[PDB]
Design a protein around this nucleic acid. Structure first.
Lengths: 47, 63
RNA sequence: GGAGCUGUCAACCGAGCGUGGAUCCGAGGAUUUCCGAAUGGGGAAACCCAGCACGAGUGAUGUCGUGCUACCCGCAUCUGAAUAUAUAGGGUGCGGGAGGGAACGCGGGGAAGUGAAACAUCUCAGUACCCGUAGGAGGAGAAAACAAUUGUGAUUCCGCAAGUAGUGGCGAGCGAACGCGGAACAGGCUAAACCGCACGCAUGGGUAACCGGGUAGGGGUUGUGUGUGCGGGGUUGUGGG
RNA sequence: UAGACGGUGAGAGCCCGGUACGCGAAAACCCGGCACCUGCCUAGUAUCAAUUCCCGAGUAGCAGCGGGCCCGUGGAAUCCGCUGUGAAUCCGCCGGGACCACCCGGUAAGCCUAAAUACUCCUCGAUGACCGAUAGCGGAUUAGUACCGUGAGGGAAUGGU
RNA sequence: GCGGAGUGAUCUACCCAUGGCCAGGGUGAAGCGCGGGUAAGACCGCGUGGAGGCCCGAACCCACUUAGGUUGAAGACUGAGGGGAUGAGCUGUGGGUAGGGGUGAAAGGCCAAUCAAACUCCGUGAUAGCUGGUUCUCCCCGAAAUGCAUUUAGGUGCAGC
RNA sequence: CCGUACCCGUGUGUGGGCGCCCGUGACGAAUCAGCGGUACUAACCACCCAAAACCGGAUCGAUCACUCCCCUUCGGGGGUG
RNA sequence: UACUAAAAACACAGGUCCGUGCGAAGUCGCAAGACGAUGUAUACGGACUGACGCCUGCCCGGUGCUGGAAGGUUAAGAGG
RNA sequence: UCGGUACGGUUUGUGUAGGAUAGGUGGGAGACUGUGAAACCUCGACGCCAGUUGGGGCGGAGUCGUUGUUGAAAUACCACUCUGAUCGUAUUGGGCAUCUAACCUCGAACCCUGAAUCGGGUUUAGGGACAGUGCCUGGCGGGUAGUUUAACUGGGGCGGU
RNA sequence: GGAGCUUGACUGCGAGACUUACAAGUCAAGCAGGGACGAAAGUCGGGAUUAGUGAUCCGGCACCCCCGAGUGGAAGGGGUG
């Protein structure tokens, strides 16, 4: 699952850095909290 | 826990079980339906939803 | 339409009607107890007992008459708890449904008997039966198809190809297509790049090249991107936008 | 243009009701002509370059367990469903019977689509080298009655002055 | 006899809730009281009182021997004798369990007179190497019961006639 | 039906009684200020701990540093100060 | 054992053995959900035997149960 | 933590060789010492105490090299050389532990129920990436289902064929 | 029975018969190739003959381009042992 990280996470890194999620960590941890977004066109919004 | 997918209509398949001797009998291929809570917005009520895994991969994904 | 009627079963009586158009035949219309999907609630169906409103009645309770009130789905819409948004739910209002229907069809389910001189594989059969769900017919459909260089150019249905090729404890038996020849032949609409709106989310909250392109000025103001939905555009294979 | 059947006291063209044939619609209703009503369109065609973008996504394809296709898992295509992995947007994709290359055909993963076709409970008309009351549906007669069975259901016989 | 879809627990099997009945006699337990003894007891003899899957014996309920009936008065009875009869009881009302399943103090019985898998219908016009029946006549001709093979010797195939 | 009873409900009035409005009987608070509980608690006090920092005795060692005598192969010790 | 057999059959009390630590095991149900039980190891379920008295001997080799997992064998999958 | 795989990487066992503890060796037999040394020592590895090797003083500047006595080197620049062992390093999995975040909780409290012990939800407490559930696969499996279980036969059976 | 050399314990055919329900079995002079034996003429297509075995389907091995799902190949199939 490719997300754009919006808040610092030790597992992944800094805001907007990268993503290497094992398909589910984001599904039930990040997305409920709002710590990252779906990398659809946020890659365009960011760059 | 093989109920028809609430958001697709995916039901179970019916067919045969070919044994070694080709002797047919009746079996059922239930879809892998898992129990999740239903959320429509941030901080939602978490109702309940019996949903297929393909939608867990993409669709009404809450937690 | 026209001179006789009061139905029939079974027809003996009585009493009336009929040229002013009876009886009778056809259409429309009103009425239409009670039950039944049965729907105000209940229930040994054809029973019982209620609520609301309008109205009738009594010296006054009783009583009566006519409407309304099942459930569910969807739509509109108010409030929208538990906790703060908020939602589920609740409330109001507006539409539809259930059940029947001889046969036919579609989708889904799915035996045995029998045959195989036993018998499981196979068959009988995707039959009998069942469930869903319509229609007057349905379903299917407008090529990500056939053939293999004569090339054809949506579907369906009948007859050939044929009981062939082939498939099967190569046993019982099952059983195509290509193509030819007929009935009938109509093919049309959306998504998307993009453009412009409404709304949603960040940034710039004044630097935005936005405000119709551009010419020359102007304001420096919500520029930009991105999510939902609306409107244009486009819908095709010698590829088209 | 009436010899179709039938009825009438025994076998009817000319006795009757009828047929042939020709008339006949206030009111309702199906089809149908016309008007209103309704609704689409201020052109995208011609040309060229292809640097840019699109052409149906948890889908197709692949592997696994099955159905069905002449095709019983066999070397097994294509089609369908289930579970995990999980593509592309035309220098693409699918198919042409494992499969690779070349060639060819065609562009899936959205929708609607009349005709040819299947059936007659039921309603007029018509026929029949079909029976004529132990036959025809069981039901020409109080018929799915009487009757049997707690019930699902079973299920009679009787015509002629 | 198999299968599918249905029907039935009003007789019967079992259970839950609610009621009634179980005449009348008899023996006479625990506990209690009295008196004796004993330190206190064990303990003994009386009385009250009245328990028992107790006794005898009617209704009720079972159905043991024998006689009878046996095309029966009756699709399971009767007469005369028997057992239980305050309990694991009998009985009515209303309710549930339904088929390869139920129930069962178990016998493989009972489930609408039938149960080693109930009944009606549907598939069904099922099947059967076996039995049974096959409707009028004439004329000519005229067999075998033998071999080979059989999941076969009571059938069939080829050959022979 | 004769005679004698009983429960629910409606009303007609008859009279007495209650309260309703007025009134009236009864019930009935604590804020403001003084005092006590020391409850919290500045300052301050009792117990003991680190009693911080600093000073001191002892202890040895295969540590190091200054000195005595003996040994040497020149590289360490001994009792010690 | 209605409708030929009421018994030397059945059944209970008692006695053993096995299972279950609780929406328990078992059973009915595809699952849900019930019973078991508004209970719970001195309870409950299953099997054999059948008051009381005396007693209940030896063998774990076979076939089952239970515990272990040295070692062998051992599918799919991963890998290939 | 471990495994396994790979990598920047190296290294290791007395028949007989005896101043080369080498199953095997070379894009060829000097890197270097004077491009701040061997060696005597030490002991890390080695360590059966053979001497490879350096953990380390040295020596402050070669014992050596086709010196040959192994197989021809005294593996020194060079090729990764049966590479035990092994630095860490790409990968990978297992196992284990911990953690909470999906998920479960007929565990509690509150609420739409003032008509509810079902259900659904909020918050809290506790289990926990387990279990369960779907796919695939192996195994146990008369609890259940469909059939077979031969014939001849001096009747059948046993026996024998 | 004994001995020398040898592999005909062959290939491609086989008129014509017996036997028999059928399948199946049995015998075959003789022809061609090529060759062992034999001086030659000639014999030999297993054992002195009669038993020493088992149909069909499916599958496997070697070989023969026989076909090859558009084509060229391939798979698979086909043919002989």
């Amino acid at each position: 699952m490719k997300l754009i990280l919006t808040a610092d996470v030790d597992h992944l890194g800094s805001i907007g850095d990268t993503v290497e999620v094992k398909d589910g960590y984001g599904r039930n941890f990040l997305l409920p909290r709002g710590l990252a977004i779906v990398a659809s066109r946020g890659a365009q919004k960011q760059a | 826990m093989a109920a028809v997918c609430d958001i697709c209509g995916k039901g179970p398949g019916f067919g045969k079980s070919v044994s070694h001797s080709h002797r047919r009998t009746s079996r059922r291929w239930d879809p892998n339906i898992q129990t999740v809570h239903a959320v429509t917005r941030p901080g939602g009520n978490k109702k309940r939803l019996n949903v297929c895994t393909s939608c867990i991969k993409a669709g009404k994904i809450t937690r």
